[PDB]
Design a protein around this nucleic acid. Structure first.
Length: 204
RNA sequence: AACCAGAAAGCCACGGCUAACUACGUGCCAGCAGCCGCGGUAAUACGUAGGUGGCAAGCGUUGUCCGGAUUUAUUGGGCGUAAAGCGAGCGCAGGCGGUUUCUUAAGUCUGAUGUGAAAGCCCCCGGCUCAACCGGGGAGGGUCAUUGGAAACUGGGAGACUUGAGUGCAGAAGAGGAGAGUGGAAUUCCAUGUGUAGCGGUGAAAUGCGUAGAUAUAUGGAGGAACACCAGUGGCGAAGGCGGCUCUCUGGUCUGUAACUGACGCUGAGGCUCGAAAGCGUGGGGAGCAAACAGGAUUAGAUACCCUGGUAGUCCACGCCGUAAACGAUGAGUGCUAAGUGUUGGAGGGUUUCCGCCCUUCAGUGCUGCAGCAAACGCAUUAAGCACUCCGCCUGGGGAGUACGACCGCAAGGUUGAAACUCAAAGGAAUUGACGGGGGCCCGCACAAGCGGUGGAGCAUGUGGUUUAAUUCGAAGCAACGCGAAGAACCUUACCAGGUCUUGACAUCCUUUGACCACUCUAGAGAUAGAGCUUUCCCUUCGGGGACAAAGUGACAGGUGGUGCAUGGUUGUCGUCAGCUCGUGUCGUGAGAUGUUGGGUUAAGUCCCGCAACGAGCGCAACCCUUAUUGUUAGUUGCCAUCAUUUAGUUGGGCACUCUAGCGAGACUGCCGGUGACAAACCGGAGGAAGGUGGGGAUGACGUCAAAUCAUCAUGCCCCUUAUGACCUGGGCUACACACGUGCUACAAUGGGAAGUACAACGAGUCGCUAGACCGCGAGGUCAUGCAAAUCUCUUAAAGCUUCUCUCAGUUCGGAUUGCAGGCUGCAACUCGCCUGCAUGAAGCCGGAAUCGCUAGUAAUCGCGGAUCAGCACGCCGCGGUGAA
């Protein structure tokens, strides 16, 4: 293998961490509470289709935020769902949690959402080729600069594994002022587990 | 007329040809197939099941004949390289033939008559309830026989011609052939004079000839063979082939004229002639060269390539054989279809000194090229184009030009020429890639130049092996072996011996519920067992809920069990090498090609120039981090210059410097000269701290290697389930006849010892770094001191620098190994820690063949820190000091 996780390079330089705090001498509880909370909202993603998670740090409380393409579905009917969040969270935390929400815009040009969708389609035994192609269809036409898409594994629920994908636009990688995103998902019907990885580029 | 849906459907097949698909079973076994081919753990191909499709009183398999086969080509094929022009001529028989008048009517067309049995195939009509079937009536078939016409074509008869053929007359060239003599140069042997120790040979050498005078050198003699220069994609011949000179005999070709005969032509099975080199017979001749052979060499072996000798043969006369890649792999005759360009031999016309130019034409002889053709490669008036005549030859690759038979030959052999059996191929051309002991250009500690290492010694470590009750698993050329393991005494920990459990150590549900703890004493190696105060409602609306046990209940959990060859993800390498691609146009019958090539340039597919290509993407570079100069903003826990004082930058005083760290500034071929097509770029220069990617790092394109990993994690399938799941103690993983990889300490005088003497940098610190002081020589202990930080500590770094002693020895070097007494952490250091003191004092005096690293603050050498971590580092990750060739 040879390549480098691309949001593992622009981190710190032009894009910043997504857990903004500072903890000297208290640096395992904070980490393994952040991990706990980050894991336990995977229930929402089943339908809410969230993208990001921040972990701010109060004086003695927990302020976070999220983004998802459906604000009504997450907060619920009369905001009661967010209350179930609060009460499950503080019980999970032992610390007063103060959540917040912002709506994501142009949810086509994300990366985790797109991988979520194409893995979804691959679950329903659909042709990977047209899946990738219509993904990049709706993506590029939303206004972008380049997309690549890779798929690997026991393709078409078939014999010895392979990998191949298609790309339009143009995506420079070794350059740094790139702001390129990246997302990697998984699925399978009955043949082990497949692999899809997606890269976008939306400005330097 | 009566009664009953009642007694009455099988067969082949479903991967492509071909119409019709999915489960279960087996696992290169069973088995199947007309041909491709299926079968080694998820089979539409094997077997059953269920579906589907084709036919249906039938359905399949075998055997046989025609088809598709243009694969015997009359309709209707071919011979440059794919199978196939005889080696070439002379020619009886035969096949085919210039132009015109008259004639005849064999061939030809056409008319009448006879005749071509009946039943069949076909056409019309007809009869059995229709159909087969039956019936009537018509055509078709001759190359037949007789008889009548026509006269173009071919044939037969009497004619006439001149273009084809041939002859005459006038000229031209030639290594065309046979016979007879003759010339010079050269090599060799011989005779003689001079002459002294070598000659000759090879990649290197040797064998060999020589002091019975060699090689060399000079004079003459002998003998046989081939003909230096002219020599030319020139000449002649039917082909094989022919080159010194002169003579006697002798064949063929070409141009002119147009006297003469009047189609006398072409091709040509059997036959006859000629026929390179090697070979045979008989008789000569023999200088060089050379199969066989001998000796010398190289080689694992070399009856071969290389060297020194050498016999038949090579030559001459007369016979014999009759074969070559006998080639242009291209049968012969004849006529038609653009050009350009040389050259051998001619004949005409102008200029003319033309015998030196120019124009027309005949005949050979080469190169380029248009139509056309060709599967492409290519050929193209010297067709492999367009067409007629005559000949030869071919029909998948092997078996094999073999066997038998026949003819020829003295003999070797030659000509002619199969079948049994086997396979699904064997072939021609052309594209992409790879490879070469083929070529051209250019890079890298890859060579060369240096410095230092390993292989020899002791010890640490990871392996292979062996032993074991177990030495738990993985890693296997470079790209495994100080590797996962960045801390094996218990664990950790998979493995072995024991003692133990079952919805189980861990998760969820459900029934009763309801709040488990914790604590002590016993027996125990603990796991546990047994008793003791006990786990106690955290909401109440009067009804209830969570944490919680414990029991039960079945839902079940559980696995470091299996498959990197079913997989996701994550790495190693080619490689920091410079490459890999696409869209649209254009070329090619097609695989494919153009771009991406040529010239210049470069670290580079980096740029410039020209070009059927125009444009683009991942790559290169740049954007990033750090190091070197510094402006400014800020001055403590940092700094101390201007002042004072104290042990001191401490404490006053200050922020100047130093440093800390934000924002700025700065290197861009920016200006100078030159080289260069004025371009790109290149050589030198100024200025500047750094000059030409300033030094270093992060950054790893398409893909190769079924490389590695189910043991970080995840996961299909297969598997264990009162046991491969689970709890505890004790031992392993540290075993030792042995082979290897990586490291450390050394074999001393640039050194050993003793005593004084200064200078860094990176980072760690609350149950931890210890200040200071006291004690013991030491590892350390005791009491106490700051420090959650530029303050305090680890921590005055060690090599360095200055003196003294030791004298070349296994030494005062080396300190492995071992006895004894201690220290620290640890519930516990025999197995199996680190360290101290004393005592003993091993191998070891620079290491073979071989082999590694390195181009500068590098190599070499000396210390510091920290990751994991009670504790344990010669390892690993960083820092700094000294400083070469």
């Amino acid at each position: 293998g040879q390549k480098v996780h691309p949001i593992g390079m622009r981190v710190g330089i032009i894009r910043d961490w997504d857990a903004k705090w500072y903890a000297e001498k208290e640096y395992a509880e904070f980490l393994h509470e952040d991990l706990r909370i980050r894991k336990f909202i995977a229930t929402k993603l089943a339908d809410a289709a969230v993208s990001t998670i921040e972990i701010e740090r109060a004086a003695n409380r927990v302020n976070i935020s999220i983004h998802t393409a459906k604000p009504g579905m997450v907060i619920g009917k009369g905001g009661s769902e967010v209350e179930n969040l609060r009460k499950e969270l503080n019980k999970l935390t032992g610390k007063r949690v103060h959540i917040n929400i912002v709506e994501i815009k142009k949810p086509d040009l994300d990366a985790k959402l797109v991988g979520e969708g194409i893995a979804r389609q691959l679950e329903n035994r659909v042709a990977f080729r047209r899946a990738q192609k219509q993904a990049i269809q709706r993506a590029m036409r939303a206004g972008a600069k380049g997309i690549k898409t890779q798929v690997s594994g026991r393709l078409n629920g078939a014999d010895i594994a392979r990998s191949e994908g298609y790309s339009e636009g143009t995506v420079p990688l070794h350059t740094l002022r790139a702001d390129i995103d990246y997302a990697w998902e998984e699925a399978d019907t009955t043949y082990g587990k497949l692999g899809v990885k997606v890269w976008i580029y939306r400005g330097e």
